[PDB]
Scaffold this motif. Sequence first.
Motif, PDB file in Angstrom:
ATOM      1  N   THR A  53       0.822  -1.218   0.000  1.00 32.93           N
ATOM      2  CA  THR A  53       0.000   0.000   0.000  1.00 32.93           C
ATOM      3  C   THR A  53       0.853   1.264   0.000  1.00 32.93           C
ATOM      4  OG1 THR A  53      -1.754   1.197   1.152  1.00 32.93           O
ATOM      5  CG2 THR A  53      -0.201  -0.046   2.519  1.00 32.93           C
ATOM      6  N   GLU A  54       1.868   1.296   0.868  1.00 38.88           N
ATOM      7  CA  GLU A  54       2.735   2.462   0.984  1.00 38.88           C
ATOM      8  C   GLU A  54       3.467   2.713  -0.333  1.00 38.88           C
ATOM      9  OE1 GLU A  54       6.413   2.543   3.347  1.00 38.88           O
ATOM     10  OE2 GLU A  54       5.426   4.092   4.473  1.00 38.88           O
ATOM     11  N   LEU A  55       3.943   1.635  -0.965  1.00 37.93           N
ATOM     12  CA  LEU A  55       4.689   1.753  -2.221  1.00 37.93           C
ATOM     13  C   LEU A  55       3.843   2.398  -3.317  1.00 37.93           C
ATOM     14  CD1 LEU A  55       4.993   0.352  -5.223  1.00 37.93           C
ATOM     15  CD2 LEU A  55       6.969   1.569  -4.194  1.00 37.93           C
ATOM     16  N   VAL A  56       2.595   1.935  -3.475  1.00 34.62           N
ATOM     17  CA  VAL A  56       1.725   2.460  -4.534  1.00 34.62           C
ATOM     18  C   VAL A  56       1.511   3.975  -4.344  1.00 34.62           C
ATOM     19  CG1 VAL A  56      -0.637   2.319  -5.517  1.00 34.62           C
ATOM     20  CG2 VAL A  56       0.618   0.233  -4.923  1.00 34.62           C
ATOM     21  N   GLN A  57       1.179   4.384  -3.113  1.00 35.98           N
ATOM     22  CA  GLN A  57       0.966   5.803  -2.806  1.00 35.98           C
ATOM     23  C   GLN A  57       2.274   6.604  -2.904  1.00 35.98           C
ATOM     24  OE1 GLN A  57      -0.979   5.214   0.941  1.00 35.98           O
ATOM     25  NE2 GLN A  57      -2.977   5.649   0.132  1.00 35.98           N
ATOM     26  N   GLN A  58       3.392   6.005  -2.442  1.00 37.30           N
ATOM     27  CA  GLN A  58       4.706   6.672  -2.499  1.00 37.30           C
ATOM     28  C   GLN A  58       5.134   6.915  -3.939  1.00 37.30           C
ATOM     29  OE1 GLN A  58       6.970   7.885   0.030  1.00 37.30           O
ATOM     30  NE2 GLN A  58       4.942   8.086   0.855  1.00 37.30           N
ATOM     31  N   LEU A  59       4.904   5.918  -4.812  1.00 38.25           N
ATOM     32  CA  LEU A  59       5.183   6.089  -6.242  1.00 38.25           C
ATOM     33  C   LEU A  59       4.304   7.203  -6.812  1.00 38.25           C
ATOM     34  CD1 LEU A  59       5.755   2.432  -7.449  1.00 38.25           C
ATOM     35  CD2 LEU A  59       7.449   4.267  -7.263  1.00 38.25           C
ATOM     36  N   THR A  60       3.049   7.240  -6.352  1.00 36.00           N
ATOM     37  CA  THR A  60       2.099   8.277  -6.744  1.00 36.00           C
ATOM     38  C   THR A  60       2.585   9.650  -6.239  1.00 36.00           C
ATOM     39  OG1 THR A  60       0.286   6.681  -6.613  1.00 36.00           O
ATOM     40  CG2 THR A  60      -0.322   9.015  -6.590  1.00 36.00           C
ATOM     41  N   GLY A  61       3.134   9.662  -5.017  1.00 38.12           N
ATOM     42  CA  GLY A  61       3.590  10.901  -4.375  1.00 38.12           C
ATOM     43  C   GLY A  61       2.530  11.462  -3.398  1.00 38.12           C
ATOM     44  N   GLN A  62       1.488  10.658  -3.102  1.00 42.94           N
ATOM     45  CA  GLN A  62       0.409  11.081  -2.208  1.00 42.94           C
ATOM     46  C   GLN A  62       0.574  10.460  -0.821  1.00 42.94           C
ATOM     47  OE1 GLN A  62      -3.555  10.830  -3.838  1.00 42.94           O
ATOM     48  NE2 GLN A  62      -4.468  10.805  -1.838  1.00 42.94           N
ATOM     49  N   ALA A  63       0.577  11.311   0.210  1.00 41.72           N
ATOM     50  CA  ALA A  63       0.675  10.847   1.594  1.00 41.72           C
ATOM     51  C   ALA A  63      -0.673  10.230   2.049  1.00 41.72           C
ATOM     52  CB  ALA A  63       1.052  12.006   2.516  1.00 41.72           C
ATOM     53  N   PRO A  64      -0.681   9.334   3.064  1.00 44.80           N
ATOM     54  CA  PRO A  64      -1.953   8.704   3.561  1.00 44.80           C
ATOM     55  C   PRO A  64      -2.857   9.721   4.261  1.00 44.80           C
ATOM     56  CG  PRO A  64      -0.143   8.136   5.025  1.00 44.80           C
ATOM     57  CD  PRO A  64       0.496   8.832   3.830  1.00 44.80           C
TER      58      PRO A  64
END
Length: 93
Positions: A53-64
């Motif tokens: 989950t963190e990887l997908v958002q991190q690649l996106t550049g969006q924080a949780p």
Amino acid sequence: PAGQPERTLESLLAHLQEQHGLRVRILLHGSALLYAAGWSPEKQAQHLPLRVTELVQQLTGQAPAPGQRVLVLELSCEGDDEDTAFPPLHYEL
């Protein structure tokens, strides 16, 4: 929280490749594109120790964000029949 807790990206790719002996698929939807098949070596994709989950958002550049989030993922897989590939995954955060 829906489904089992996110363990690791390396675990997810390694698990499917070894336990099921099946090719890896790309999960993409708005946020980002998850590595699975491409010019880059397959071992490299499974190497990634970052969380799924963190990887997908991190690649996106969006924080949780706080509270429940609704996200859907599309399985991009090359095959003669659509039935071979599983339907889109529903995961909330």
